[PDB]
């Protein structure tokens, strides 16, 4: 049932993820240092982390089958709308339920809810974000399902500003059908039970997390003292 082209799609996405996700986290040494001390002491470090991840998300998106068939405008709007969501998805690889933290190789680069608070965010975002990470971790996705979900997240036709919604739909449908068939043929029960529906539910969760993050980002970025600590890429992609 899993066609040769569907296996090809999965192979491309696995390779794309391997070329854009560094599990050694070596580049974190280039970021402005984390500081745990009212002041948004983790904002510089986490802004560099997010900016770095945006670059990785773009590199992954460019390798999604069909993505470069879109216009420059549509590629841009899809990445602007999806970047925060793909960051939340891909960060799940470092997330551990042992202590509900994003463990990136060392104590300095191990992040918890208090670190996100020290970048300016509130429980309105942080609690649903932790529950998302826990719920996504509990799915115990195969790597194949993880990279397919990230690709589907990016190529969604209902994003604000999409021009050629039908072409975006055709690209996503190819990935969605690849994912649905992968689960049917490669994911053994009981883990496969309603797995596609649960994964699409996580995409809905991400839209809500996206909305709340943008709300808080807009309020944080509205203060020039905070925007001064962001990066040029973050300002371009996230806003202002």
């Amino acid at each position: 049932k899993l066609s040769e082209e569907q296996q090809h799609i999965i192979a491309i996405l696995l390779d794309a993820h391997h070329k854009t996700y560094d599990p050694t986290y070596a580049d974190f040494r280039d970021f402005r240092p984390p500081v745990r001390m009212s002041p948004l002491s983790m904002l510089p470090h986490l802004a560099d982390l997010v900016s770095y991840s945006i670059q990785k998300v773009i590199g992954f998106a460019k390798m999604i089958p069909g993505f470069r068939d879109l216009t420059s405008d549509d590629q841009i709007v899809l990445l602007k709308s999806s970047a925060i969501e793909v960051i939340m998805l891909r960060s799940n690889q470092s997330f551990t339920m042992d202590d509900m933290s994003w463990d990136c190789g060392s104590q300095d680069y191990k992040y918890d809810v208090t670190d996100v608070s020290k970048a300016g965010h509130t429980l309105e975002l942080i609690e649903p974000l932790i529950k998302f990470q826990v719920g996504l971790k509990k799915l115990n996705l195969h790597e194949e399902e993880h990279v397919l979900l990230m690709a589907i997240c990016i190529v969604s036709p209902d994003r604000p500003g999409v021009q050629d919604a039908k072409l975006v739909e055709a690209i996503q449908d190819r990935l969605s059908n690849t994912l649905q068939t992968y689960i049917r043929c490669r994911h053994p029960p009981p883990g496969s039970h309603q797995l596609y529906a649960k994964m699409i539910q996580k995409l809905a969760d991400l839209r809500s997390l996206n909305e709340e993050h943008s709300k808080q980002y807009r309020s944080l970025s509205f203060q020039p003292e905070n925007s001064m600590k962001l990066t040029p890429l973050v300002l371009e992609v996230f806003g202002n």
Partner: peptide, 11 residues
């Protein structure tokens, strides 16, 4: 607006 950094990363 204009997105020169995203455009550049998209090649």
């Amino acid at each position: 607006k204009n997105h020169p950094m995203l455009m550049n990363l998209l090649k």
